[PDB]
Each structure stands twice: as structure tokens, then as C-alpha cells.
Design a protein around this motif. Structure first.
Motif, PDB file in Angstrom:
ATOM      1  N   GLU A   4      33.885  37.675  36.006  1.00  8.82           N
ATOM      2  CA  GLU A   4      34.308  36.444  36.673  1.00  8.82           C
ATOM      3  C   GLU A   4      35.825  36.361  36.746  1.00  8.82           C
ATOM      4  N   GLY A   5      36.333  36.043  37.932  1.00  8.86           N
ATOM      5  CA  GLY A   5      37.754  35.976  38.171  1.00  8.86           C
ATOM      6  C   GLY A   5      38.367  37.249  38.723  1.00  8.86           C
ATOM      7  N   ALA A   6      37.619  38.353  38.747  1.00  6.40           N
ATOM      8  CA  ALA A   6      38.130  39.592  39.323  1.00  6.40           C
ATOM      9  C   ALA A   6      38.468  39.425  40.800  1.00  6.40           C
ATOM     10  N   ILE A   7      37.621  38.711  41.552  1.00  3.54           N
ATOM     11  CA  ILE A   7      37.910  38.519  42.967  1.00  3.54           C
ATOM     12  C   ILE A   7      39.201  37.728  43.137  1.00  3.54           C
ATOM     13  N   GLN A  12      44.623  37.217  44.882  1.00  2.00           N
ATOM     14  CA  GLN A  12      45.829  36.452  44.599  1.00  2.00           C
ATOM     15  C   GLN A  12      46.970  37.314  44.083  1.00  2.00           C
ATOM     16  N   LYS A  13      46.676  38.313  43.257  1.00  2.00           N
ATOM     17  CA  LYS A  13      47.727  39.162  42.711  1.00  2.00           C
ATOM     18  C   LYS A  13      47.662  40.601  43.218  1.00  2.00           C
ATOM     19  N   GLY A  14      46.680  40.941  44.052  1.00  2.00           N
ATOM     20  CA  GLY A  14      46.539  42.318  44.492  1.00  2.00           C
ATOM     21  C   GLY A  14      46.342  43.285  43.347  1.00  2.00           C
ATOM     22  N   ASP A  15      45.750  42.818  42.248  1.00  2.00           N
ATOM     23  CA  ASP A  15      45.590  43.621  41.040  1.00  2.00           C
ATOM     24  C   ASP A  15      44.579  44.729  41.295  1.00  2.00           C
ATOM     25  N   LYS A  19      38.851  47.147  36.498  1.00  2.27           N
ATOM     26  CA  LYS A  19      37.627  47.895  36.780  1.00  2.27           C
ATOM     27  C   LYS A  19      36.458  46.919  36.714  1.00  2.27           C
ATOM     28  N   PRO A  20      36.312  46.066  37.730  1.00  2.00           N
ATOM     29  CA  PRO A  20      35.414  44.917  37.622  1.00  2.00           C
ATOM     30  C   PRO A  20      33.956  45.293  37.787  1.00  2.00           C
ATOM     31  N   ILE A  21      33.114  44.515  37.124  1.00  2.00           N
ATOM     32  CA  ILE A  21      31.666  44.589  37.279  1.00  2.00           C
ATOM     33  C   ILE A  21      31.267  43.507  38.275  1.00  2.00           C
TER      34      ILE A  21
END
Length: 113
Positions: A4-7, A12-15, A19-21
Motif C-alpha cells: 500500500e502506497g507504492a502507487i 508522486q516521487k517517481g520512485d 519492489k512493490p507487491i
């Protein structure tokens, strides 16, 4: 669980270091030449429709291991800004849980804006 919050981090930060699930909500082709798959994905908190698949990953879709409701870990991705909209291109991933293992959409994510 889902990252949660990876998107939000990606938009927002182009991070690109995470390595998101994520869960695949929908995958669909654009045919015109090798097709391009577009994905609606969920991080458990948000959904986002602007994911595309690198063509190198097409066999995962074509052999039905990457399918709606499956859960994947993204190992490499790029964010581009279109001429008009940001788009996330998935370059490397692994399928952690098949669509059949997961079975249902996880949670009630909210569309990102």
C-alpha cells in the motif's frame, strides 16, 4: 500483503527503487506487430490504469500465468511522462500467487488521481 502506497510513491516521487507487491485487476491487449498489454493494477490502497508490460514479459500473459487477480512482485519498472499523463512500464516481475490461488480482488482500493 500488497504494498500500500507504492502507487502513490511512483506517481508522486517517481520512485523506481521500490519492489512493490501488486495485484493485477485487469490485463488487456492493444493489437495493431507484437501486441502491447495494458494493466490495471492495485497496491491494496489505490488502483492505477496506466501500467504497460514490456514485450519481453508477453509470454507470461500468453501462457496465462500473468492474469487478472494474480499477485506479482515488480522487480524493475520505468515511469514515463507522455506528451499530453504518466505511464508505468513494468520491465521485470515475478508472479507470487496465481489468479486461482488469490481468487478475488484484495481489499477495496480507490482509483488514483
Amino acid at each position: 500483503q500488497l504494498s500500500e502506497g507504492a502507487i502513490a510513491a511512483i506517481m508522486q516521487k517517481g520512485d523506481t527503487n521500490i519492489k512493490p507487491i501488486l495485484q493485477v485487476i485487469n490485463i488487456r491487449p492493444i493489437t495493431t506487430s507484437p501486441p502491447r498489454y495494458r494493466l490495471l493494477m492495485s497496491d491494496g490502497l489505490n488502483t492505477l490504469s496506466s501500467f504497460m508490460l514490456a514485450t519481453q514479459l508477453n509470454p507470461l500473459v500468453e501462457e496465462e500465468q500473468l492474469s487478472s487477480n494474480c499477485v506479482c512482485q515488480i522487480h524493475r519498472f520505468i515511469v514515463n511522462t507522455l506528451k499530453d499523463r504518466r505511464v508505468v512500464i513494468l520491465m521485470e516481475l515475478e508472479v507470487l500467487k496465481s489468479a486461482e490461488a488469490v481468487g478475488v480482488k484484495i481489499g477495496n482500493p480507490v482509483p488514483y488521481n
